[PDB]
Amino acid sequence: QPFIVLGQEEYGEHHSSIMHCRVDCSGRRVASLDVDGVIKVWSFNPIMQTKASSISKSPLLSLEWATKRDRLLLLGSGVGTVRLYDTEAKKNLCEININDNMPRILSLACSPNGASFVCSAAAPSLTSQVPGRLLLWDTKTMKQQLQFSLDPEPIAINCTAFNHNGNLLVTGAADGVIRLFDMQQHECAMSWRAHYGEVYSVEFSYDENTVYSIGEDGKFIQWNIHKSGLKVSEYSLPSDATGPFVLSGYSGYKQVQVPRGRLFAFDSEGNYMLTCSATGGVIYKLGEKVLESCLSLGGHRAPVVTVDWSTAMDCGTCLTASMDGKIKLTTLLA
Ligand SMILES: *CCC(=O)N1CCCc2c(C(=O)NC3(c4ccc(Cl)cc4)COC3)cccc21
Fold first, then answer.
1. Which compartments is it annotated to reside in?
2. What does R_g of the chain's alpha carbons equal in angstroms?
């Protein structure tokens, strides 16, 4: 048994399907966002306690904790704006407008060294091949530095992740292409066709020899970071890992969520991966053509649509967030 389950608790303050829930860099605060544009900042250790609440007038699409200033939260809107929110003072410090009408701020990533962040800003969704941009921001001035050219065409970037030092940024796009940016030369080092359909999440492996991706074709793929488009391993996930995520009644009425928040998360050493399913988090060991499901966290009566996995004080915390607005917090020890 890789993990002992110490407890499962429920955070139930959201009354709408969850878009995002991320643990802060200190491993002690959650920021969660639902489809009604309600932001909650909450603690869970030693008890569940709401620290900040606010309903956005404008639609909110993305959420990223600052890396050196634990209390600062970046919020991306659907109206071409990035907000810097102080969770301690419970006030907006900054709102900045993105030029052109690429109003959809789909992705935010803070550099590990705290000096910069990137955001993707996309046109409104009409086809899968809507134009998008990738912007680099300086945290010290909160001013835009540059925009990365995207080849062969401007395209919506769905997901972004920095490596440990912050010299590489991996991206997944609506055209199914993964682009790896050198953040010192500010250029595309590497790009390849990763998925048939949209890329939903990307991450560096612990050892950073590979990047992991999940996409609309239902595939979980591990890529060789030294050889463009060369697969290390590849699995067909069950369909409820990638959606679309559906909550029905007997009304004829249903809610449908295509992935927006992170579809996978990893333990501190990247040996294990948390994924969505209809009834809760499913954890796999990373290493059999059929992938090795070793722990099911359960506890959900509606589809899980986004996950996180945080480790602090030698104790792991799994977030599983479902379309009923419920967030299950499962405590795992090695
Ligand atoms: C948007 C312009 C503005 O009104 N302010 C006032 C307070 C915030 C701010 C900063 C700033 O806090 N810069 C940090 C920082 C910003 C964003 C993140 Cl994600 C992390 C760190 C640099 O250490 C604080 C700078 C300039 C102007 C504004």
1. Early endosome membrane; Late endosome membrane
2. 19
